[PDB]
Amino acid sequence: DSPDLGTLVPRGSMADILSKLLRLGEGRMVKRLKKVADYVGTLSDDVEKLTDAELRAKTDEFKRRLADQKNPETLDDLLPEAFAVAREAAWRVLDQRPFDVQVMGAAALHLGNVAEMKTGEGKTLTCVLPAYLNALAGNGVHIVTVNDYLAKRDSEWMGRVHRFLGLQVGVILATMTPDERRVAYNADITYGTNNEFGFDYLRDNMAHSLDDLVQRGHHYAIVDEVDSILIDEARTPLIISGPADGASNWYTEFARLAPLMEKDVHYEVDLRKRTVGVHEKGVEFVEDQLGIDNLYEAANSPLVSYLNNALKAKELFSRDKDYIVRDGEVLIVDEFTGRVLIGRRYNEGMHQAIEAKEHVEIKAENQTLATITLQNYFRLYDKLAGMTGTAQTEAAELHEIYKLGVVSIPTNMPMIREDQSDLIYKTEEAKYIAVVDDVAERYAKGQPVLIGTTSVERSEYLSRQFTKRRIPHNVLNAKYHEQEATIIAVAGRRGGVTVATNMAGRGTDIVLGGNVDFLTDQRLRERGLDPVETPEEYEAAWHSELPIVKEEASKEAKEVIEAGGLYVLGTERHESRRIDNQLRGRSGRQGDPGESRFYLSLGDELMRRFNGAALETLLTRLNLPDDVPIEAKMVTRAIKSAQTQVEQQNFEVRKNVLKYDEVMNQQRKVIYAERRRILEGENLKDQALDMVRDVITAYVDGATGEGYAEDWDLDALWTALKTLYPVGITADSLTEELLEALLKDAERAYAAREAELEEIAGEGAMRQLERNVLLNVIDRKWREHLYEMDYLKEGIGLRAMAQRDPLVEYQREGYDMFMAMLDGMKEESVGFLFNVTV
Amino acid sequence: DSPDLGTLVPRGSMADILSKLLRLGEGRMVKRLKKVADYVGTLSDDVEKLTDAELRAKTDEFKRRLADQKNPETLDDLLPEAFAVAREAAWRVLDQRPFDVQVMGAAALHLGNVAEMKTGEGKTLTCVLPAYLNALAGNGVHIVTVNDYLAKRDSEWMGRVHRFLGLQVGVILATMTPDERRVAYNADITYGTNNEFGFDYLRDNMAHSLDDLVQRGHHYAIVDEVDSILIDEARTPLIISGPADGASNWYTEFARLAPLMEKDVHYEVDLRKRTVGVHEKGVEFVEDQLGIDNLYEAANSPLVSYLNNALKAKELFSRDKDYIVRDGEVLIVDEFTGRVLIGRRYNEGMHQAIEAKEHVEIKAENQTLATITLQNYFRLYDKLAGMTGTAQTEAAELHEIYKLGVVSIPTNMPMIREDQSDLIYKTEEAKYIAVVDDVAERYAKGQPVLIGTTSVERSEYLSRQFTKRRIPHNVLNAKYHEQEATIIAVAGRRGGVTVATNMAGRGTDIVLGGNVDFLTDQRLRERGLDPVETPEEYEAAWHSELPIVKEEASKEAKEVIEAGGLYVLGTERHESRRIDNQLRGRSGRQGDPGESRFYLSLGDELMRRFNGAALETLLTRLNLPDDVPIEAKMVTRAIKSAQTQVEQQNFEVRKNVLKYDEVMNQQRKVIYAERRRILEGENLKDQALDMVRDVITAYVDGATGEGYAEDWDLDALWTALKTLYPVGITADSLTREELLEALLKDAERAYAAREAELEEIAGEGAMRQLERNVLLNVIDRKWREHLYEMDYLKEGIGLRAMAQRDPLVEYQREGYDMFMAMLDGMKEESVGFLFNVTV
């Protein structure tokens, strides 16, 4: 709740006023961000005057100014100076000094926003400034890129600047091991993909020892290509899947035991409470059949539930009454309708028991073992920002899901690219002969072309035409990213002809004359040099050779400027206007000249999914021939419409994925919390006993209800309690008082048990036993929740009536099993706490 | 405005109240019809007592009771008696006396409604009653059936009752000559298809002579299978096309002559009015070039129009401003957007003119020569009625378009057919094995099965599945009506299996134990007996054969009833629930036991048009086995809605077809009215002269609006008036608002001059014949030409649908403009040829 007068960086209250008059397009934020940038610039002499050793000592200066309690300074306080330091470092190390519009964008990202920075504005380098500043706080900065090649590359590339400044830079990649990941996460700044970050988080919350954890919290994340990761890729959740994890031999084993058991002799049935209770003879019978001395003895085999469940299966569920068998499938049927309630299975391992009862084949099965959406994953960070050339069109969604504002940073030079109107053809065949001719023309004239398509299949068709016209070219298909960067790096020398499927060659700049940085790095690496492996020599070689590389390329750059800049050819519209605009954006960087144009047809994938065929017959009827561009105002409105409709479809899909994810997200936050505190080693005696208390209290509450005199079933209550623990008093012992009695007995039984462990290998043995058993129970019963939650999602669709909203229905039913799951968790825990083999 | 107390049949004002109350299912009309029926029944006794000779004579009593001017009676006064007489005739002739509910429905049909009588209620014989009554008026009745086979059959079968009663019954068939149709139309009752009626109407209004007309007005039509014809079939217009037969040679020849001509010397452009005038000298240049004496001398060659267009083309339309040339087309582009306004062409021959100017290849085309929608065709009749088992769900459209109401007639016996609910399968594979297993089990138990499919391939697929399984069956594919009817007539014997794709074998009832009525006739026909060709012999043989065919059947009719009656198994769902219902309605005739069920799946064509595949992805993920029927409100919902969407789509197309047809329908009523006048030898002397007056007046109006004094071009006005007629006074002698009066008087005298020149060549009123030849020739050529342009206008107007514009409104404006332009050019060119044509 802060003031603004005489404060360079918008503090907090003032930041909101800007971060929100944002959506309103006035640009006070930009005006602000510009003032910050100017001021940073005025510090440029002060840093210029310093040795390499005097820079980099600055890291330690800032670090110490951040902790001294006498003269407290914050990151906002340090921003002018730290940005000056990072900027000068970048200049000395890379030979590239961040422009003013980069410093602006830097401020915007420190302030937690999406900086919309046009292609060729220096995204990757801008990034260094907020990454350095925040890295000083000492908690980690995560930098998210679109694939492993780019993560490794940016980490090694830019990590030069960070490393020059004292900091340590990490990268996570698909191949790394848990130990390698650890180190990368312990760095001051860590690069990686949403994938690797997400899954690491998933594996962490499945870990069995605190030592296996690889991440260290979620403090600050800068999401490179934000629209691609947070909007586009968000439609898909991350799922670690896996098999059931056993427990099938028991279902079969108890299905065989249950029928060898005389009703009223081994167990009793409460035909209208809908319950089963097992007698002394029954317990003992099961015990001797398994050569076991207690049904809660072997850890992680909840033999009480299995038994009970199997008896319920035998006694309480009737074949052809409640359910029918159909293909090794237990299908539940309506009361006296008699008709299969599709999607519906039985609860808390009862389905399995019924299956086992009906001798149904038991099959191999996978299920969710962990999940998070990219949405809820990135919502974990205390601060969040991102960068991209195209984000203003996702502002509303970025604000609603992430609280991320979008600031358009002005470009370094004025964009002068000619973005031409679509040429719409009648047929695919027509469009492509006309495409090939423009490209062949362009080639002969020297101009470099980038032609994008929308499928690998259409890239090879276009390259077959390209060879049938003898035009030397490459196709990039988005598979081998590195070798595709190499091509891209020289896509804008003259003669250049590059065909890119989807957005292939993402994030390497198509520089006219050639990418001077990319090429300099290549000279050095082919000679076996490395920024990390051979640091001093890479640096020295860099400074020496960059100007050479810059020469031979930028001599040819004047020639490429002559020929019109880059020609961007669109062969199809993408699944959103955003991406088309991204492709156009590949050209015209840094005020370079350049052309863009899309060729389209009523026969394109897009149009074919809507009304293109219908239009093509009409236009063929109106005697309009194939090789003529359509100027029809209505074919135009039709195209815009098709793409808009695709965009909205994807949005709905996203919106759904997340709204169905919130349910599970809430539940996992609780389950992860539980697992974490066990991992941490917390003393749980208080909760262990609370559960014992809780469980006894629940059981008394059920067997006693409201009945006055004799009425209470103490024998049933006693037997049900006696499963879990050695009850040290009789019902006769003392004949709401019945509960206060049993609790007190149970507590002593507990301290007795605790000392039994002390004797077995004690001095906290019961403290460990508590943790060990809990974690076990939680995991086993959580796995089963997820497997049952899987079936609930898939099915919830069909059970949607004449007005409902199935998400309410799913939410209702979903939390229900979640509570049931937690109750069952407590029960079996106290069970094992007393009776487990040590 | 009519009373009703003491009147049996609802007269005018009161039939109205009953018609209106109809759409609210209060059942008030059904009550009245029942009352009408009952009274007819009290009249049986009197007709039972008559000779056949005396019954046939009843027809002549009726006709003469209608033409009586002293004690005048209407068809409504005759309904009780004519109905009773038709009813008893039928009993005597067919050994089949129309039931009470048949008499009800008949009154409903006479009253101009759709009687909804269920399948097997006797639709086809019921209709004999209102047709007979109405036929008495002597203007003809049209019975419309779905195909030629059915038209021929009902005309011969039921014509037995009409011919006995003294009437003549005709049929029109796709194969008949004009002369053959004409006789058929002259009959008291004529059967036929919407196609045959429609096309005869179209062809009539193209006739070049009164003798050629085949039809004789549209007095009363009973549309059999109303929903199939007036709703489903309405999607599609009737069109006669042909070669444009254009004046391509003249456009070419005038494209040549236009540049040889010199501005201000041969002709004069007017950059403001968008006008060209050919000078004295030009007229003679073209005259010499073609070797002609007057530019109106050659019949059907409006050389004045062609020449003026070529010049306008030359002077008034600019290549690369107003239009461009691309791939042998003229494409109009905007003044400045510069963009190709595709669709658009120029008007009144200007487009051709410009094409020729640009040395463009002139391709021969086919064009519309006449068209009507079924809607506007059937709107022609004074009375309209219809029969069907399923009308009630189309009531609103039937009322909006046709002003037809729908009375549900109650059935003879209570309907006891068991209509089972859909079995829906996850896959197409599984549904078909369920179907075959069912057909298998029911073959074994004796019971006849009708299996419906929605394509021929699926029908064929099911044939093989059956054969693979030793079940003898039949497939009817809708191709061959007489033989598929033959299979149908026995589909209801023990062991019947019949695969009917789409609705094959419509109009023949699947009678249990076998179709006695059908089989008797088939016998009689094998013996060379024919109801028209050997009337008396057919009758006598029919009377002895029927009771026999009946015996031979009845034994196993008992057995098919025991077996459960007909079983109707549907294989997928049709494009509307209505059709689905028609299939079900094949079972359960006249009280008979029966059962229907449809087997559906999420891979049916219908579902696959929509979300069907999505559903089976879901269902498999839920582990439901392929062969377990799906009962889920959500899947029932999705099947309903696929079908509903199809209905809705069909309804919209239907709405669109008629919307666009109204514009042209108005236009052709005018033109048809013209052609008739001419074709009927009417004296057009006055019309001729009004056109003469009309055209001269407009020329004057155009040369003499403002200016007042000698600010007029009397040179141009004279030169142009001279194209049309021998102006006998020429300016000078006049120099007001007169000159119009002067010049008219002059033309009037010139007309009498012409007229005499004609009597001088051919004589005694021969100029009358010139006004007729010339008017007809000019209309037909100019309207034929208008259709050609209206062809192009209709196609490309769908390309004008921007946000808020309604393409129908623009199409009306422009279409109506061309229509009016066309009309003016009709007048002009007519006076030209009238004055100057070679005789």
Annotate B317-331 with DSSP letters as a single string. Answer: --BTTTEEE-SSSEE
Indicate the residue type of B45: D
- Taking the CA of residue A309 and the nearest CA in chain B, the distance in Å comes to 23
Largest CA distance in chain A: 107
Q: How many angstroms separate the CA atoms of B606 and B655, rounded?
A: 22
Indicate the residue type of A478: A
Q: Is B358 on the interface with A (CB under 8 A)?
A: no
Q: Are strands A238-243 and A366-372 parallel, antiparallel or unpaired?
A: antiparallel
Measured in whole angstroms, how far is the alpha carbon of residue A547 from the centre of its chain? 42
Q: Are residues B626 and B774 in the same domain?
A: no
Closest CA to B828 of B676, B693, B727, B673: B693
Residue B1, Cβ neighbours under 10 Å: how many? 5
Contact A340 B618 (CB under 8 A): no
Contact B618 A327 (CB under 8 A): no
Indicate the residue type of A653: V
* Pure H helices in A386-508: 395-402, 428-445, 456-467, 481-489
Does B650 fall in a domain? Answer: no
Q: Which of B326, B634, B801 shows the shortest C-beta gap to A634?
A: B801
Given in angstroms, what resolution was this structure solved at? Answer: 2.8
Contact B342 A619 (CB under 8 A): yes
CATH number of the domain to which A352 belongs = 3.90.1440.10
Q: Are residues B215 and B304 in the same domain?
A: no
Residue B20's region, left for phi above 0, alpha for psi from -120 to 50, else beta, is: alpha
- Whether A227 and A374 have beta carbons less than 8 Å apart is answered as no
Closest CA to B770 of B751, B744, B747: B751
Question: Which of A413, A444, A479 finishes a domain?
Answer: A413
**Helix/strand/coil for B68:** coil
- Taking the CA of residue A369 and the nearest CA in chain B, the distance in Å comes to 18
Indicate the residue type of A360: V
Contact B327 A633 (CB under 8 A): no
CB–CB contacts below 8 A, A to B: 67
Q: How many angstroms separate the CA atoms of A714 and A718, rounded?
A: 6
Q: Are residues B675 and B809 in the same domain?
A: yes
Q: Are residues A29 and A140 in the same domain?
A: yes
Q: A residues 596-625 near B, CB within 8 Å?
A: 618-619, 621-625
Residue A234 phi/psi, 5-degree rounding, is -60, -15
Q: B residues 634-653 near A, CB within 8 Å?
A: 634-635
Q: Which of B326, B327, B802 shows the shortest C-beta gap to A634?
A: B802
- Taking the CA of residue B634 and the nearest CA in chain A, the distance in Å comes to 5
Closest residue of chain B to A638, computed from CA coordinates: B802
Give break positions in chain B: residue before each, C–N beyond 2.5 Å: 735
E strand or H helix at B527 = none
Contact A342 B624 (CB under 8 A): yes
Q: Which of B342, B632, B803 shows the shortest C-beta gap to A342?
A: B632
Q: If 0-12 CB within 10 Å is exposed, 13-18 middle and 19+ buried, where does residue B94 land?
A: buried
**Helix/strand/coil for A423:** strand
- Taking the CA of residue B614 and the nearest CA in chain A, the distance in Å comes to 12
- In order of A301, A488, A495, A635, B3, the CA distances from A450 in angstroms are 62, 9, 11, 26, 86
Q: Are residues A261 and A314 in the same domain?
A: yes
User: Long-range contacts made by residues A460-467, C-beta under 8 angstroms, separation at least 24?
Assistant: A461/A432, A462/A432, A462/A435, A462/A436, A462/A499, A462/A571, A463/A499, A465/A432, A465/A436, A466/A436, A466/A439, A466/A497, A466/A499
Strand partners, A405: none
Does B499 fall in a domain? Answer: yes
Q: Is A802 on the interface with B (CB under 8 A)?
A: yes
* Number of domains comprising chain B: 4
- The tokens for A429 are 């065949």
- Taking the CA of residue B653 and the nearest CA in chain A, the distance in Å comes to 15
- The tokens for B59 are 């027809």
**Helix/strand/coil percentages in chain B, nearest 5:** 55, 10, 35
Q: How many angstroms separate the CA atoms of B219 and B384, rounded?
A: 9
Q: How many angstroms separate the CA atoms of B322 and A362, rounded?
A: 79
Cα B789–Cα B791–Cα B796 angle in degrees, nearest 5: 100
Q: If 0-12 CB within 10 Å is exposed, 13-18 middle and 19+ buried, where does residue B13 land?
A: exposed
Which of chain B's residues have a Cβ under 8 Å away from the Cβ of A634? 799-802
Q: How many angstroms separate the CA atoms of A397 and A383, rounded?
A: 18
To the nearest 10 degrees (0 to 180), the angle between helices B516-526 and B481-488 is 130
Which of chain B's residues have a Cβ under 8 Å away from the Cβ of A355? none
Annotated binding site of B for ATP: 102, 120-124, 509
Q: How many angstroms separate the CA atoms of B687 and A322, rounded?
A: 90
- Whether A631 and A421 have beta carbons less than 8 Å apart is answered as no
User: Does residue A120 have a known ligand-binding role?
Assistant: yes
Closest CA to B343 of A613, A637, A624: A624
Q: How many angstroms separate the CA atoms of B131 and B162, rounded?
A: 9
Question: Which of A349, A378, A413 finishes a domain?
Answer: A413
Residue B385 phi/psi, 5-degree rounding, is -140, 175
Measured in whole angstroms, how far is the alpha carbon of residue A810 from the centre of its chain? 23
- The tokens for B428 are 């197409």
Q: Is A747 on the interface with B (CB under 8 A)?
A: no
- Whether B835 and B757 have beta carbons less than 8 Å apart is answered as no
E strand or H helix at A390 = none
Annotated binding site of B: 102, 120-124, 509
- In order of B438, B450, B569, B756, the CA distances from B562 in angstroms are 18, 17, 19, 89
- Taking the CA of residue B339 and the nearest CA in chain A, the distance in Å comes to 6
DSSP string, A317-366: --BTTTEEESSS-EEEB-SSS--B-TT---STTHHHHHHHHTT------E
Q: Are residues B238 and B250 in the same domain?
A: no
Does A647 fall in a domain? Answer: no
Please identify which residue in the block is written with the tokens 């679509």: A422
Does A424 fall in a domain? Answer: yes
- Whether A111 and A15 have beta carbons less than 8 Å apart is answered as yes
Closest CA to B570 of B557, B558, B587, B556: B587
Please identify which residue in the block is written with the tokens 């059935």: B411
- Taking the CA of residue B449 and the nearest CA in chain A, the distance in Å comes to 27
**Helix/strand/coil for A70:** coil
Contacts with A441 (C-beta within 8 Å, 6 or more apart), sequence order:
none
Does A38 fall in a domain? Answer: yes
Q: Are residues A178 and A291 in the same domain?
A: no
Does B651 fall in a domain? Answer: no
Does B653 fall in a domain? Answer: no
- Whether A545 and A520 have beta carbons less than 8 Å apart is answered as yes
Contact A342 B801 (CB under 8 A): no
Q: Running DSSP on this structure, what letter comes out for residue B394?
A: G
- B795 CB-side CA count, 13 A: 23
To the nearest 10 degrees (0 to 180), the angle between helices A516-526 and A535-562 is 140
Q: Are residues A385 and A343 in the same domain?
A: no
Q: How many angstroms separate the CA atoms of A550 and A516, rounded?
A: 6
Rounded-to-10 torsion of CA B573, B578, B579, B581: 80
Indicate the residue type of A526: E
Residue A182's region, left for phi above 0, alpha for psi from -120 to 50, else beta, is: alpha
Q: Are residues A27 and A70 in the same domain?
A: yes
Contacts with B323 (C-beta within 8 Å, 6 or more apart), sequence order:
B317, B330, B331, B332, B333, B354
Contacts with A31 (C-beta within 8 Å, 6 or more apart), sequence order:
none
Q: How many angstroms separate the CA atoms of B8 and B32, rounded?
A: 9
Q: If 0-12 CB within 10 Å is exposed, 13-18 middle and 19+ buried, where does residue A723 land?
A: buried
- The tokens for A293 are 């001395």
Residue A628, Cβ neighbours under 10 Å: how many? 18
Q: Are residues B162 and B48 in the same domain?
A: yes
Q: Which of B342, B628, B634 shows the shortest C-beta gap to A798?
A: B634
Measured in whole angstroms, how far is the alpha carbon of residue B200 from the centre of its chain? 10
Residue A617, Cβ neighbours under 10 Å: how many? 12
Q: How many angstroms separate the CA atoms of A704 and A708, rounded?
A: 9
Which of chain A's residues have a Cβ under 8 Å away from the Cβ of B795? 618, 621-622
Which of chain B's residues have a Cβ under 8 Å away from the Cβ of A621? 795
Q: Which of A624, A625, A797 shows the shortest C-beta gap to B634?
A: A797
To the nearest 10 degrees (0 to 180), the angle between helices B714-724 and B280-290 is 30
Q: Which of B329, B623, B632 shows the shortest C-beta gap to A798?
A: B632
Strand residue runs (E) in B156-237 = 169-171, 189-192, 220-223
Contact B799 A343 (CB under 8 A): no
Contact A331 B621 (CB under 8 A): no
Q: How many angstroms separate the CA atoms of A337 and A330, rounded?
A: 17
Q: How many angstroms separate the CA atoms of A38 and A36, rounded?
A: 6
Measured in whole angstroms, how far is the alpha carbon of residue B172 from the centre of its chain? 15
- Whether B555 and B581 have beta carbons less than 8 Å apart is answered as no
Closest residue of chain B to A331, computed from CA coordinates: B624
B779-799 burial: b if 16+ Cβ within 10 Å, else e: bbbbbbbbbbbbbbbeebbbb
Contact A625 B327 (CB under 8 A): yes
Which of chain B's residues have a Cβ under 8 Å away from the Cβ of A633? 802
Cα B107–Cα B110–Cα B114 angle in degrees, nearest 5: 85
Query: Domain range spanning residue B589?
Result: 414-631
Please identify which residue in the block is written with the tokens 């007048």: B827
Contacts with A686 (C-beta within 8 Å, 6 or more apart), sequence order:
none
Interface test with B, best of A324, A333, A342, A628 (most B CBs within 10 A): A342
- Whether B825 and B348 have beta carbons less than 8 Å apart is answered as yes
Which of chain A's residues have a Cβ under 8 Å away from the Cβ of B622? 342-343, 791, 794-795, 798
Q: Are residues B585 and B690 in the same domain?
A: no
Q: B residues 292-351 near A, CB within 8 Å?
A: 326-327, 329, 339-340, 342-343
Closest residue of chain B to A635, computed from CA coordinates: B799
Contact A329 B799 (CB under 8 A): no
Which of chain B's residues have a Cβ under 8 Å away from the Cβ of A331? 624, 628
Which of chain B's residues have a Cβ under 8 Å away from the Cβ of A618? 795, 798-799
Contacts with A650 (C-beta within 8 Å, 6 or more apart), sequence order:
A232, A235, A575, A576
User: Long-range contacts made by residues B55-62, C-beta under 8 angstroms, separation at least 24?
Assistant: B55/B85, B55/B88, B55/B89, B55/B92, B55/B164, B55/B165, B56/B164, B56/B165, B56/B166, B58/B82, B58/B85, B58/B165, B59/B85, B59/B136, B59/B165, B59/B166, B59/B167, B60/B166, B62/B136
- Whether A466 and A569 have beta carbons less than 8 Å apart is answered as no
Contacts with B480 (C-beta within 8 Å, 6 or more apart), sequence order:
none
- Whether B143 and B190 have beta carbons less than 8 Å apart is answered as yes
Which of chain B's residues have a Cβ under 8 Å away from the Cβ of A799? 632, 634
Indicate the residue type of B382: D
Does B636 fall in a domain? Answer: no
Contact A622 B800 (CB under 8 A): no
Closest CA to A173 of A156, A380, B189, B595: A156
DSSP string, A485-513: HHHHHTTTSTT-EEEEETT-STTS---TT
The residue count for chain B: 839
- The tokens for B675 are 């052609």
CATH number of the domain to which B533 belongs = 3.40.50.300
**Helix/strand/coil percentages in chain A, nearest 5:** 55, 10, 35
- Whether A143 and A156 have beta carbons less than 8 Å apart is answered as no
Q: Are residues A67 and A165 in the same domain?
A: yes
Question: Which of A350, A365, A380 finishes a domain?
Answer: A365
- B549 CB-side CA count, 13 A: 20
